[PDB]
Design a protein around this ligand. Sequence first.
Ligand code: VJQ
Ligand code: VJQ
Ligand code: BR
Ligand code: BR
Ligand code: CL
Ligand code: CL
Ligand code: NI
Ligand code: NI
Lengths: 288, 288
Amino acid sequence: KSQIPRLSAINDLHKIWPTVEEHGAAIIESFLSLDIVRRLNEEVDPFVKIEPIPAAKTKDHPNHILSTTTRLVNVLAPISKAYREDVLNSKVLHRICSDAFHVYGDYWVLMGAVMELAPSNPAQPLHRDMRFSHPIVEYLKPDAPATSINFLVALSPFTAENGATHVILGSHKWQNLSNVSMDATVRALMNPGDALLITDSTIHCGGAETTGTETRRLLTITMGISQLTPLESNLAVPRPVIESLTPLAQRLLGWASQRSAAPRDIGLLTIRGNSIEKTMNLKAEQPL
Amino acid sequence: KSQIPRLSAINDLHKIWPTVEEHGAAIIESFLSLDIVRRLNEEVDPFVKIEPIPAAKTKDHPNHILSTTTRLVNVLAPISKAYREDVLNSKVLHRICSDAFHVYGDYWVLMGAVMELAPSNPAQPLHRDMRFSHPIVEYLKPDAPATSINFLVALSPFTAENGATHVILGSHKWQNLSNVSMDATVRALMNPGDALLITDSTIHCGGAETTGTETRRLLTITMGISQLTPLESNLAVPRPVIESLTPLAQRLLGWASQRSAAPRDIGLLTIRGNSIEKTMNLKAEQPL
Ligand SMILES: CN1C(=O)c2ccccc2NC(O)=C1[C@@H](OO)c1ccccc1
Ligand SMILES: CN1C(=O)c2ccccc2NC(O)=C1[C@@H](OO)c1ccccc1
Ligand SMILES: [Br-]
Ligand SMILES: [Br-]
Ligand SMILES: [Cl-]
Ligand SMILES: [Cl-]
Ligand code: NI
Ligand code: NI
């Protein structure tokens, strides 16, 4: 079996999206620097510790899919300086997304989440993403360009032993799913800061944690066309935090109007022909 | 040629969506009471008068499609008490939308706009809606249930002479568009408060104003699945106005989390497993 193509964030930038379009998966080596990974980890650490079980009885939007041991923290903008500055303005992320979504137009964050898998976390069932939030995606024609992609960034080592991601290469082009099996998968062995990039059609799963000692952490960034509703809201993020961001970061968090690729585009989230940012006189790059 | 089916808002409620699903169009007689139409007209009147041309050079999201004579006013919640109370809580609208979008899940307002057509306004080209904002819609399978519907509510008389809407019945099921012609259309002759309901696949157009004296006004309410991004934003609507609304109205304006029809739905616009309304402690039905 062919292994997941491994590409440089520095040199092979133009090759990344074409590789994912062909194979359905690619490893971006050093997608984030170890400095950014260190700062991300430090900032989200306490929020991961206080996070209840995914299907906690206190929640009015419980996640009944994720294992009880799993901890997911989303809406990272108010938590993490490293996320809202370094990650949301990543030159590599924005080149890949502009390559991926040019047919549709503007893209934004459907969800940026830190996931921590506790020791002995079982393997997820093989799946395509978006099926528990966007039923519309299943009604797209087979040859429809991907409407979302998922950056799975290692914040700790991904090994075969501690539950590194499984992917079926070429599975993003599959219509008949009779050959779906763990037998057909290859592993995303990754150092902290490496990213596994998949599409919403790539068949994949979290691996089994088999050591019983290792805690595995990842930053999952689902980037999707601005025509699809995000899984997470930034509506409650304080305006000072939003006004500290770049205009691009503001757009990614839904604090700006959006544009389609239609030649005479009439726009999304507009206010009587004017943008959110113009109407509300929204400042950008104002330090806290 | 068969005329557009005409249905009672009072009696034929369960028949409305099935009729639109079959024929692609239906007239809902007295969708809004003349009292609601009167109050809507009074409240939006000044905002229509101050509205610049659709492609005004002052706008950063100009509409290059609509005729220079046309005036479109959206984000009606802050303008109109009648809209935010009576229209957004319409029992008829909510039954039709729940019938239409049950396969997908929650729905909301993609755009609520008052359109005023000046005397001698030319006929629009025959078209399907959403092609200038949501390119994704064109990539849906032919048998995909409609992801948006458009309520075209008469706020003044619709006559053949003053440019009443044209529709091609059955055109919502068309894949080959070689027979698209004004020869194949029938007219939506409507009294104020009557509504023409079409899908995002129904081929239709605004009619030609041929008198040179009559101004025609309509309330266009595009209702769409919560998985699709609205054309308009309510982000700048004052919180007091939002807190005066029903929870249902708040959801329709994107001031609440949303749910898909997926058996184990994980939700849209959520905040770490909690809703917008729970997180922000958003009050409902608090008078101004
Ligand atoms: C349920 N669920 C998530 O919560 C999720 C989490 C982070 C990013 C994207 C996500 N979307 C998604 O579709 C799933 C799915 O994982 O990607 C899934 C399927 C089957 C088993 C375990 C997970
Ligand atoms: C451009 N445009 C609008 O602005 C619009 C206005 C109100 C409601 C929905 C709308 N969406 C839409 O798709 C069109 C389209 O009309 O529905 C269209 C096409 C061709 C000619 C004139 C209009
Ligand atoms: Br994983
Ligand atoms: Br019309
Ligand atoms: Cl899990
Ligand atoms: Cl027009
Ligand atoms: Ni997944
Ligand atoms: Ni139209």
